[PDB]
Nucleic acid binder design. Structure first.
Lengths: 214, 127, 220, 181, 34
RNA sequence: GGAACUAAUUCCGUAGGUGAACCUGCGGAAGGAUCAUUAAAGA
RNA sequence: CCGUCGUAGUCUUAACCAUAAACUAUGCCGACUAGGGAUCGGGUGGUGUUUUUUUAAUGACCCACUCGGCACCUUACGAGAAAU
């Protein structure tokens, strides 16, 4: 004899300033009561929204983003970056038969000393005139590709403060410099960041979080 | 346009789970399954039941403050079957035609970079 | 008056099954609506409360939305139109807000009452003369009569040990009889004049009976 | 008041479906009143529902299921059946699911399901009124739930290395006890 | 004794008719001919 | 008990066994019946 | 004609045992006898293709050849009871 819905208070979630749409979704909490409140619950939640819902454009159907809530201000709770994933359906289609797959990754620091591990995947493409279907590189090929990818990724992560990497990933410049330094080794197709995770963030610093929001 | 939540359908064999939550996941909103809407054990998974649970879930779903929903369909997974149960597509078919506008639905069955020994042994299980 | 889940509100005449007029309204769920009328009058006022703290005083003859009062920070569960004009709106968050209503643009917030309970419903009681005590229903189920001139509570009918919330109150008002629908699914009749005393208790439904045991000398 | 479902098309099954395309989209757009776009570069079929032209909300969901059925390598006629009959569903499992088989052991296993000149595979569908697809390690089934459960047991009995004859026995047993009812 | 002797785009099927035994268990054209 | 009335698939190596007309676990073998489709970086 | 509990075991170190249809159910080294297209590795040849930058150098690819591989195809001026 209670009903949970008629007790909680609806809340509004706002995305980071560097995004196509600030508005994201609404959530249910629990009245900020004396002893156990609505303030504590909202801070640790995260939200997975496909950036195509978050950028509008569909040339972005895959690629999912983690938005974590850090601060709150009355029916208005802000968010920052917490990671990026791909979509499972898109990844399955990319793994075609008779072709080499290549992955590489590095754990690396930024300016505003978040620590992250970013990913990268690419596949050997057929030479547009090639009689042989397999088109497999040569391990020696693979070794070199990963070392260059690894090279390029560490350069981007150290240069990017944290938010800048965000601004770096969205237009996928990374994806292309790869292809550029790569095409001298072996063809390759797709080539994406694929997944990035956060594992060590610095300290709150309420000032820095406010700067991202507009 | 709508208010978005998350649908999330676990459809194994021998039962089908439907339950909608807040887009973050932390706070949920109504569940009900196929085992709930019939009594016969044997008939716990069947589409007929899932439809009934899709019906109940739709009611409470719009009873609170949700009008729309993204679904994340899912089989058992792990070292198990990996294929969609019967009453998961039927649980989504009965949920699709209910007004709740849908949007973007991916598969989320846990798939390992394989391992931990499957159950059954060399002979294997179900026959 | 009917309030839709979408927030669109349509007014239907009780006698004939037709809609006199349809109002698009605010873009939110409609928490409650209140009608104002005189056995015979050329003025009729309808007040609608959204899930958010927005009150629109739709005017039926004018067919316009006169006023917007987003003083409230939460959906207005209960709206009471006080007799001439001041509008009293129950606040889900905790704020119960007085208002001044007029046909013309001029309107203002006369007073704000802070009460330590959710305002499930509220009303104006004629008893107590000029110092009308607003009738307030809360989540904690403690009925409160509050001075208008001061924010102090003249009398509180109960605190109940059972953890229940009164969903809504049906009051005769002329007969000074208030019916409270409790979250333990019981109805209490309270007369209106320190602790409010229930004249009688009527239980609508018993959810589960743990055991049946006869007691008392009469055995009835 | 729109609705958008977008399904990826496999390259191997892409050519037959594109060739029959002209037989494919008309029953959708004309018989069911629906919008069927096709992105050749992204190899993705896009089914959009128009509120003015779509009588049933379920039809948009039905259209996506029909495209997927053909996607799984089923026949166009089988895909048409999904729109016509609701009771028809598809079941997919991995041979590795029922019995971990390596190399040639897997290969031969597949043959025991197919049989010489498809004879083993064809008998199960006729006696179970269903449609089966033998992909790589994936097997797909298409039909009524009660029909699929009987068909899955017969297919599993094969994949367990039981001899085809025994499976014929169980098959005519089940087909008899169900066509009787 | 002298006189001589003599579909829909969406198919409609009952739950019992299709493979929904569970729905039929809980389940609860003369005018057209006229 | 007495006496009335009315009604009418095969096999191998290995290990173990108390519902063992033999079976079971682990790994092998075939000396066991391959239909169907298959260019979609078809940039 | 299975389901449940589950001891040893399953994994690892140090030591044993010391055999399998341990099978292509076909000793080793060499030498001769006949055709074809694929493929793995290596090398040679090209005013071949593609990558652009300013042409290259690279790389991947195409053609011809040649060693050495894992295999398949067709056949004989050969062999077999016959499959081969």
């Amino acid at each position: 004899v209670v009903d949970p819905f008629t007790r909680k208070e609806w809340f509004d979630i706002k995305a980071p300033s560097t995004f196509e749409n600030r508005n994201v979704g609404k959530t249910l909490v629990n009245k900020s009561t004396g002893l156990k409140s609505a303030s504590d619950a909202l801070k640790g939640r995260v939200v997975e929204v496909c950036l195509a819902d978050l950028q509008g454009s569909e040339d972005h159907s895959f690629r999912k983003i983690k938005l974590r809530v850090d601060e709150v201000q009355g029916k208005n709770l802000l968010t920052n970056f917490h990671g990026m994933d791909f979509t499972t359906d898109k990844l399955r289609s990319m793994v075609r038969k008779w072709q080499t797959l290549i992955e590489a990754n590095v754990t690396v620091k930024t300016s505003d000393d978040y620590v992250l591990r970013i990913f990268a995947i690419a596949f050997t493409r057929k030479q547009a005139n090639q009689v042989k279907r397999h088109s497999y590189a040569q391990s020696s090929h693979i070794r070199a590709i990963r070392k260059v990818i690894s090279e390029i990724l560490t350069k981007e992560v150290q240069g990017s403060t944290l938010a800048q990497l965000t601004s770096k990933l969205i237009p996928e410049v990374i994806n292309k410099e790869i292809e550029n330094a790569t095409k001298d080794i072996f063809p390759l197709q797709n080539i994406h960041v694929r997944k990035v995770k956060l594992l060590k963030q610095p300290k709150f610093d309420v000032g820095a979080l406010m700067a991202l929001h507009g | 346009s709508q208010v978005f939540g998350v649908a999330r359908i676990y459809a194994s064999f021998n039962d089908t789970f439907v339950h909608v939550t807040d887009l973050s996941g932390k706070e949920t909103i109504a569940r009900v399954t196929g085992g709930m809407k019939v009594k016969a054990d044997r008939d716990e998974s069947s589409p007929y039941a899932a439809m009934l649970a899709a019906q109940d879930v739709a009611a409470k779903c719009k009873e609170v403050g949700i009008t729309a929903v993204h679904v994340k369909i899912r089989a058992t997974g792990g070292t198990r079957t990996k294929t969609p149960g019967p009453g998961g597509q039927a649980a989504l078919r009965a949920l699709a035609r209910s007004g709740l506008r849908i949007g973007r639905i991916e598969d989320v069955t846990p798939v390992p970079s394989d391992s931990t020994r499957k159950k059954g042994g060399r002979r294997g299980r179900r026959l | 008056a009917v309030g839709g889940t979408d927030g669109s509100i349509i007014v239907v005449d009780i006698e004939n099954g037709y809609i006199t007029h349809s109002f698009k309204g605010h873009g939110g769920t409609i928490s409650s609506l209140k009608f104002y009328g005189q056995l015979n009058s050329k003025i009729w006022l309808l007040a609608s409360g959204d899930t958010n703290g927005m009150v629109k005083v739709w005017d039926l003859v004018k067919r316009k939305c006169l006023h917007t009062l987003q003083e409230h920070t939460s959906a207005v569960r209960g709206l009471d139109i006080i007799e001439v004009l001041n509008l009293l709106s129950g606040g889900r968050d905790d704020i119960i807000n007085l208002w001044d209503f007029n046909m013309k643009k001029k309107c203002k917030l006369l007073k704000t009452l802070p009460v330590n309970q959710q305002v499930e419903s509220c009303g104006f009681l004629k008893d107590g003369d000029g110092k009308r005590i607003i009738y307030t229903a809360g989540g904690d189920a403690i009925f409160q009569l509050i001075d208008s001139e001061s924010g102090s509570v003249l009398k509180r009918t109960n605190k109940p040990i059972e953890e229940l919330f009164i969903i809504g109150v049906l009051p005769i008002l002329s007969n000074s009889q208030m019916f409270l629908v409790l979250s333990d699914q019981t109805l209490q009749l309270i007369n209106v004049e320190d602790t409010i005393q229930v004249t009688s208790s009527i239980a609508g439904n018993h959810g589960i009976i743990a055991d049946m045991r006869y007691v008392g000398p009469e055995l009835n | 008041k729109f609705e958008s479902r977008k399904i990826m098309v496999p390259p191997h099954r892409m050519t037959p479906l594109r060739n029959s395309w002209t037989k494919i989209y008309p029953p959708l757009v004309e018989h069911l009143k629906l919008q069927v776009r096709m992105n050749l570069k992204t190899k993705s079929v896009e089914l959009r529902t128009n509120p003015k032209f779509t009588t049933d909300p379920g039809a948009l969901q039905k259209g996506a299921d029909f495209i997927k059925a053909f996607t799984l390598g089923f026949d166009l006629d089988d895909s048409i059946a999904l729109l016509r009959l609701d009771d028809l569903y598809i079941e997919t499992f991995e041979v590795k699911d029922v019995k971990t088989l390596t190399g040639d052991h897997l290969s031969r296993a597949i043959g025991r399901i197919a049989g010489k000149d498809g004879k083993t595979k064809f008998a199960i569908e006729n006696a179970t009124r269903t449609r089966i697809v033998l992909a790589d390690s994936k097997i797909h089934i298409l039909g009524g739930f009660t029909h699929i459960r009987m068909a899955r047991e017969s297919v599993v009995s094969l994949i367990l290395g039981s001899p085809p004859g025994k499976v014929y026995g169980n098959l005519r047993t089940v087909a008899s006890r169900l066509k009787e009812r | 004794r002298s006189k001589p002797k003599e579909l829909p785009f969406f198919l409609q099927l009952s739950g019992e008719k299709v493979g929904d035994e569970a729905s039929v268990r809980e389940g609860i054209h003369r005018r057209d001919q006229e």
